[PDB]
């Protein structure tokens with residue numbers, strides 16, 4: 179099985195892990211407190227510290243809030259060359275001077291940041307998206323990483339919508355707040 183990583187152990191990380199397992203992946207979780215977090219996951223999931231989880235995969239969902247991104251900054255060297263999927267949402271339209279994905283890309287300039295899956299609710303990862311709204315909006319400045327995440331979305335039974343460069347991340351983040 180291909181291994182996919184998830185950082186964090188909350189509602190989104192748990193829902194994502196369900197969907198990844200159902201669609202044939204092996205999941206490794208990076209948690210601040212993996213002994214405690216291990217009960218939030220089945221035994222088939224490898225729950226460990228961030229620095230161990232990153233050695234087991236090249237594709238990592240960053241299932242934490244923007245305000246906690248800097249808690250990962252000491253991992254920068256270990257994260258070089260890895261794909262980081264920015265799934266985050268904000269409470270306000272155009273909340274910060276940069277989109278969350280551009281902010282993550284600035285923290286990890288030698289990682290490959292891809293925006294995606296922020297429009298999918300935790301409940302939709304468990305049940306599946308509504309048939310008229312299977313779309314997941316994906317973008318990145320790295321074409322190869324963008325295509326890898328597009329293929330992952332297809333394997334998770336979503337319809338990937340390729341919006342090109344990471345400049346698209348701002349309005350992808352505004353979309354849940356717009357109607």
Ligand SMILES: NC(=O)C1=CN([C@@H]2O[C@H](COP(=O)(O)OP(=O)(O)OC[C@H]3O[C@@H](n4cnc5c(N)ncnc54)[C@H](OP(=O)(O)O)[C@@H]3O)[C@@H](O)[C@H]2O)C=CC1
Pocket residue numbers: 185186187188189190191208209210211215240241242243244246249250265266267268295296297298299300301
């Ligand atoms: N909930 C949802 O339905 C959706 C959420 N999202 C996005 O997914 C991400 C997570 O959302 P959700 O799961 O709801 O958020 P949570 O509030 O559940 O936080 C998730 C994880 O963040 C980690 N965390 C908390 N504080 C820190 C810290 N100081 N340093 C490092 N890691 C920390 C914890 O993991 P640990 O304690 O294991 O380290 C926690 O389990 C957010 O960006 C959110 O916008 C996107 C779409 C839907």
